[PDB]
Amino acid sequence: NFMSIVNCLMQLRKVCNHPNLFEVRPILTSFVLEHCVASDYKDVERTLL
């Protein structure tokens, strides 16, 4: 659309503060893939035994 003063403004922000105003160093933690496969075969196992 148009953007010409925001460049200078956020450049000023980066020169002034530096490592913030977008993101910080985060607290690292594992991904939480959650679909799993145990419940898929639990019914089959219970039927089998």
Partner 1 sequence: KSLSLIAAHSHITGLGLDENLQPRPTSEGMVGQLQARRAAGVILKMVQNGTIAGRAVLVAGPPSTGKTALAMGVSQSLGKDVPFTAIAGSEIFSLELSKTEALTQAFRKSIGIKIKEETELIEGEVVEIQIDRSITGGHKQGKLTIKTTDMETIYELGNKMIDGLTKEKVLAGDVISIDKASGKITKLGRSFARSRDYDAMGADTRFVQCPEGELQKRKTVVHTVSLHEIDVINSRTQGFLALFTGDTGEIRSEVRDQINTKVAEWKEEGKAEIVPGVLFIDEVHMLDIECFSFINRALEDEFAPIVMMATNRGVSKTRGTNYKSPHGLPLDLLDRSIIITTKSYNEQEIKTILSIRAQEEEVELSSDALDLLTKTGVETSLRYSSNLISVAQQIAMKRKNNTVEVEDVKRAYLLFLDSARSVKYVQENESQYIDDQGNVQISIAK
Partner 2 sequence: VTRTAAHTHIKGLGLDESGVAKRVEGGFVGQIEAREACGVIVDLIKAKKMSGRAILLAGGPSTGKTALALAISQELGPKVPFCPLVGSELYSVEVKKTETLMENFRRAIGLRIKETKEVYEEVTELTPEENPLGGYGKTISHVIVGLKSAKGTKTLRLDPTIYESIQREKVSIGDVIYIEANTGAVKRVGRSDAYATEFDLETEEYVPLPKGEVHKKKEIVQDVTLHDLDVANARPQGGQDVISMMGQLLKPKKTEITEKLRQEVNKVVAKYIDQGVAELIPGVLFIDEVNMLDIEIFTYLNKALESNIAPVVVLASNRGMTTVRGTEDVISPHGVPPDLIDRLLIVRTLPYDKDEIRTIIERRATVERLQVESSALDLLATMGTETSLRYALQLLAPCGILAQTSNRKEIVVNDVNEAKLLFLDAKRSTKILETSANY
The amino acid sitting at 44 is V
CA-nearest of 2, 21, 5 to 13 is 21
19 binds, among partner 1, partner 2, none (CB under 5 to 8 A by kind): none
Q: Is 49 among the residues that bind partner 1 (CB under 8 A)?
A: yes
Please, which of residues 4-43 interact with partner 1 by CB under 8 A? Answer: 37-38, 41-43
DSSP 17-38: T-S-SS--------------SH
Residues found near partner 2 in the complex (CB under 8 A): 26-27, 29-33, 35-37, 40
Size of site (CB under 8 A) for partner 1:
10
